[model samples]
Target: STNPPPPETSNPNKPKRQTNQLQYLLRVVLKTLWKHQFAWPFQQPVDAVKLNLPDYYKIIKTPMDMGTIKKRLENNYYWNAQECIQDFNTMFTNCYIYNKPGDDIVLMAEALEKLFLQKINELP
Candidate 1:
């Protein structure tokens, strides 16, 4: 019989678990402040895209051509792009409000844009 492999171990030098808790709390606070500072535009459209079922089907089936694929993809892209723009705008607005020039605003926005662009480009 073969011996069982040892269980994977977490990094001993990693920060305390509460560090994640603190980070989450900070994120919640920031999100709240951002919502207060900037009214979200196209939030309804974004929500529509998020709850859409066809979008998920297309994602899983990929390279599909059900005739409506392009229209569905365009709709999804429009909503997602709208949300990304609103999110970035809110982020910077709040940053200006709190007078904190933390890189979170710009960095997160850029990363989000890149991810969205990748998804859009993948669509045929």
Candidate 2:
């Protein structure tokens, strides 16, 4: 018989078996963190065209942002809490590496990380 694999089946990439509870909790925690002032910088993806950064994409091969992570989480891309946690860490790491040391942006990333750790620790 003729058959076809829908989008769900066609997607070879896999990583999503988490329960709804964790997803909901992550959403809540993310919402809270989004409100934090420090989150504004990470709320969107880095654009090479808009800023003076040179070789930004070259240095940071894989960029991460809260906005991208949020979209992925909402779309069921994350496999589990750890996956989401990794994204958070990547976002901060990217900031530290791209921005100057001890700058406000890097400092903000630090604050958000601490706050994020506190919130994610509440999950289980």
Candidate 3:
């Protein structure tokens, strides 16, 4: 005879995946950056520079690499999102103050491309 159907094994009350706020913010930030870049090819140089993206770009190119960001987000190993956000803001301010406008625009675009690719790979 056919075996009886297995008992219901799924737990309906199982907790849903926890939403990491910092991780959510990071994803939103990355998506926004990607969106801006998507529009970059359509904008004139002056228009692009007018977008004032140096600050955002600096965050992606910061010394803290993707691996570290991933670890902190995934495992809560070292820094929290608040610390990361503050550090990013400070770094962006410094870079913006020191960099030329034209050069900053170019570097920003390049940094966005690199970081976007890195983020994709970081995804499961």
Candidate 4:
């Protein structure tokens, strides 16, 4: 009998692979919110080209465009966590009033918070 093929080698870029999962999670949450026509807490018209993710644009370009969503998140309206959190609370409160699902909203809020914190920390 022929010998079995050797196991595939492990990928060295495990951290990047792990980050891809988080990126995917963010993408799904953004797409879902965009689909439902929920209000965004920030600006409008996110550019995929500006975001530098050509592959993501190719997938979510036409029907569920994320450019608007990304632009909203990248807006300069809020300069601090307090501002962002207040906006976040307002947006989520509206979502709750509309009877949107609770769990997903919570997750989306947390993701937004983490992203906001990262952006704030990046500032000088």
lDDT string, candidate 2, 1-124, tens digits: 2222211211237867656645864577788789998787788777665665657776886687777777777677777777777778877898888889889988888988888888877765
Model 1 error, position 55 (Å): 37
lDDT of each: 0.32, 0.72, 0.42, 0.38
Native-vs-model 3 lDDT? 0.42
* Tens digit of per-residue lDDT, candidate 4, span 1-124: 1322222223344322323323333355444444442335223332335545354323432221234324333443223334333444454443344334566645555565455445444332
Off by over 4 Å in 3: 1-19, 38-71, 75-79, 106-124
Top candidate (lDDT): 2
**What are the clashing pairs of model 3?**
none
Q: Report RMSD (Å) for each prediction in the order shown.
A: 19.9, 8.0, 17.9, 17.4
lDDT of 3 at 50: 54
Which candidate comes out best when scored by TM-score? 2
lDDT of 4 at 123: 35
Q: By the TM-score metric, which is better: model 1 or model 4?
A: 4
Superposition TM-score, candidate 3 onto the true structure: 0.35
Model 4 TM: 0.26
Once fitted onto the true fold, the runs of candidate 2 whose alpha carbons sit more than 4 angstroms away are 1-12
For candidate 3, give the lDDT of residue 63. 34
Instruction: Give a tens-digit lDDT track for model 3, residues 1-124.
Output: 1322322223345332334645653666444543664434312122213555544333333332333344444543323445545533433344445456667444774566455445444443
Model 1 misplaced regions, further than 4 Å? 1-102
Cα lDDT tens digits for candidate 1, 1-124: 2222222223344332333322322244323332432223211222224444344323332121111212222223223333323443443343344333555544444444344344434332
